């Protein structure tokens, strides 16, 4: 689980969508056979800089042992070079959906309207387990896009702003999650 980081393989086969190529890391068989990591479930990765990122594994062969294969966009999101170390743990805690997520953005993209941005963010990022301090990606109409994730709200009522354990409850982006954004006549019975 403490194997060194290398880049993704050049031999890329076609997966089921075009969308889920970003969150699909690459591994060899003895890593899941040794470190007791189930397949088809998200795993949590801790770097040396204190950043935690959660992704989905896919076990093709033709892979060198003793290494973890990550994409270069995930390496730029974590902030590590090929040759660094990382900690891999399976998620043993229970996960469920969320209710509120707020978006931090710079000034130069305030001209995009909020509703179709919210719809495209919810449609492109579905089933993605979110954490604060991470830079998500989506291709708005062929143009790339970057955004920052602040605090989350839970279904049980607990408030996250820390949660570095695999037993901890994490939250995934689905539909019916409301998104906050950061940087008449009236005739009442009074006024008759």
């Amino acid at each position: 689980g403490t194997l060194t980081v290398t880049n993704l393989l050049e031999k890329v086969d076609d997966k089921i969508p075009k969308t889920f190529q970003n969150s699909l890391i690459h591994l060899g068989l003895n890593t899941m056979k040794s470190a007791n990591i189930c397949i088809g479930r998200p795993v949590l990765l801790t770097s040396l800089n204190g950043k935690q990122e959660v992704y989905t594994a896919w076990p093709m062969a033709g892979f060198p042992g003793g290494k973890v294969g990550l994409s270069e966009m995930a390496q730029k999101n974590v902030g590590v070079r090929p040759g660094d170390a990382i900690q891999v743990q399976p998620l043993v805690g229970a996960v469920l959906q969320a209710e509120e997520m707020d978006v931090a953005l710079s000034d130069k993209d305030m001209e995009i309207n909020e509703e179709e941005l919210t719809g495209c963010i919810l449609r492109k990022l579905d089933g993605k387990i979110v954490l604060p301090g991470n830079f998500l990606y989506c291709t708005f109409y062929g143009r790339p896009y970057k955004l920052q994730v602040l605090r989350v709200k839970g279904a049980d009522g607990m408030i996250l702003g820390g949660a570095k354990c695999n037993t901890d409850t994490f939250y995934f982006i689905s539909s019916t999650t409301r998104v906050n954004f950061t940087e008449q006549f009236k005739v009442t019975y009074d006024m008759i």
Binding site: I16, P17, F20, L29, M32, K33, N36, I37, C38, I39, G40, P59, M60, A61, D126, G127
Partner: protein
């Protein structure tokens, strides 16, 4: 070699049933588009060829009902073999997996959510075949044909889930 062979049969029968669902859905869409073109040629300007086209749409729905019956009995025998292993191995037991990693309750939840999605989609297709031949508003005709084509109760990521069993059985090469 007994329960694992049932997983070998179950994943392949899952993939074969998805392929016959796609073939029957293409036949149904061609018959429904011909029905709507005959109805708009009727109204812009009989019962024998309209009754014949409705009857082959009914034969397509009967084939989809047979596929759903085989889906329900496959999920029922998967539930039975998971409960058989849970009764046989006892409560307090750390079971090694039959393949490298996965336990069998994950196969039960995968079969349960696939069964729920295709069971809702079949009911929507029965309502479309009920109401297609009588309506007159053309926006609602385009909406009914789009509900046949785009299948809004079948989600995309469940295909990723089917391929998870294809890396738990081994029909695809690792």
């Amino acid at each position: 070699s007994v329960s694992a062979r049932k997983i070998k049969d179950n994943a392949a029968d899952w993939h074969n049933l998805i392929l016959k669902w796609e073939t029957l859905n293409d036949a149904g869409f061609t018959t429904a588009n011909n029905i709507a073109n005959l109805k708009i040629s009727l109204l812009n300007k009989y019962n024998e060829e309209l009754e014949k086209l409705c009857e082959e749409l009914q034969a397509t729905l009967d084939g989809l009902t047979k596929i759903q019956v085989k889906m329900e009995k496959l999920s029922s025998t998967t539930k039975g073999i998971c409960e058989l292993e849970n009764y046989h191995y006892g409560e307090e037991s750390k079971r090694p997996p039959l393949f490298h990693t996965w336990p069998t309750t994950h196969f039960y939840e995968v079969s349960h959510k696939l069964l729920e999605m295709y069971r809702k989609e079949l009911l929507l297709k029965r309502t479309v075949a009920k109401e297609l031949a009588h309506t007159g508003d053309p926006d609602l005709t385009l909406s009914y044909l789009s509900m046949w084509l785009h299948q809004p109760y079948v989600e995309s990521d469940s295909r990723l889930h089917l391929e998870s069993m294809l890396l738990e059985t081994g029909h695809r090469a690792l």
